[PDB]
């Protein structure tokens, strides 16, 4: 019985996307995962689930209703272009380097000690 | 009398009684209810004067 009514629906031709506030009714059971809402919004708006990005859910106290924000892009080539990198990475289609900023900074300050091609021979 | 030698005289020489076993006092609004019942719903108009709660003349 998990229902999705959309709200504040807007078509950004300048990011090539639909965007809307997503009101999800789920009385009895938990906050339904984003994947399920993404599939349930795909069959609603006659699109593929891959170009949909549905985030930032805050379940109202009592809990027969939650609210997230949603985006439906035109193509994945637009999605991958003009979407923040962390929200692509949730769909398992982006990987960032494991190296923490403490390593990158200690590398950067070691690289300033030496001049020229020796700057390459800092990290081995 | 009593120089530095008498320090903690009376504290030392009391028959040291261990505390009695109490059914623990209810806390919060359960207490304020219990206080309200002791005063404003129960008691009767009394001849002469109304007594204090700890009164044991």
């Amino acid at each position: 019985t998990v229902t999705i009514r959309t709200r504040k629906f807007m078509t950004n031709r300048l990011l090539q996307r639909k965007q809307m506030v997503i009101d999800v009714l789920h009385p009895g059971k938990a906050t339904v995962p984003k994947t399920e809402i993404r599939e349930k919004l795909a069959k609603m708006y006659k699109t593929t689930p891959d170009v949909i990005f549905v985030f930032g859910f805050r379940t109202h106290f009592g809990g027969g209703k939650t609210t997230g924000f949603g985006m439906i892009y035109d193509s994945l080539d637009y999605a991958k272009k003009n979407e923040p990198k962390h929200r692509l990475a949730r769909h398992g289609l982006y990987e960032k380097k494991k190296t923490s900023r403490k390593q990158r900074k200690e590398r950067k300050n070691r690289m300033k000690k030496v001049r020229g091609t020796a700057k390459a021979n800092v990290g081995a | 009398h009593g120089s530095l030698a008498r320090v903690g005289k009376v504290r030392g020489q009391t028959l040291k009684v261990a505390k009695q076993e109490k059914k623990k006092k209810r806390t919060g609004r359960a207490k304020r209810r219990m206080q309200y019942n002791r005063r404003f719903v129960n008691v009767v108009p009394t001849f002469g004067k109304k007594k204090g709660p700890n009164a044991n003349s």
Partner: protein, 185 residues
């Protein structure tokens, strides 16, 4: 330099004499009648009334048909009327001074949940609010301070989710029914 609010104010004032028999025993008369838990819950209401009652004094100094008064005064009157404290028949701001602590205690959720008769006492009412059994227009309210808007009074009932409504039957019954079939064999 940070993106924090900081803005916060007290909701009560501690009274000057801490041991007026007449006050101590009138504030416990309030706590018993209306099932509050400490004198802070009473000094909270008294303080809200005192701020209302301060704002009213401030507007009665002003000349009649003053634009700031007429705007501010009607704004204060429609607010008191909206929470069920003052009457629509009596909305005139010299009545705001003829207004006291029982009128605000009557409009708090604990007392409405009791005086609708879907609770058994005022102490049972807090239990039902605290244990999230009651709701207001499909919103489960955990908190018995909740002042009930006049339009929003009739929409106080049990939660659809609570066993007092059409809800999933609770922990003690379900354990005693499972022990009952573990007792029968």
């Amino acid at each position: 330099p940070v993106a924090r609010s900081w803005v916060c104010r007290k909701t009560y004032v501690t009274p000057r004499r801490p041991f007026e028999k007449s006050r101590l025993d009138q504030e416990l008369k309030l706590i018993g009648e209306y099932g509050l838990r400490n004198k802070r819950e009473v000094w909270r209401v008294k303080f809200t009334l005192a701020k209302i009652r301060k704002a009213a004094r401030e507007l009665l100094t002003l000349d009649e048909k003053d634009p700031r008064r007429l705007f501010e005064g009607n704004a204060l009157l429609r607010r008191l009327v909206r929470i069920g404290v003052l009457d629509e028949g009596k909305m005139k701001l010299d009545y705001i001074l003829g207004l006291k602590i029982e009128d605000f205690l009557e409009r708090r959720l604990q007392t409405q949940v009791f005086k609708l008769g879907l609770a058994k006492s005022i102490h049972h009412a807090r239990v039902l609010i605290r244990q999230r059994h009651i709701r207001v227009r499909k919103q489960v309210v955990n908190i018995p301070s909740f002042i009930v808007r006049l339009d929003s009074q009739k929409h106080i009932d049990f939660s659809l989710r609570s066993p007092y409504g059409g809800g999933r039957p609770g922990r003690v019954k379900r354990k005693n029914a499972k022990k009952g079939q573990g007792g029968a064999g």
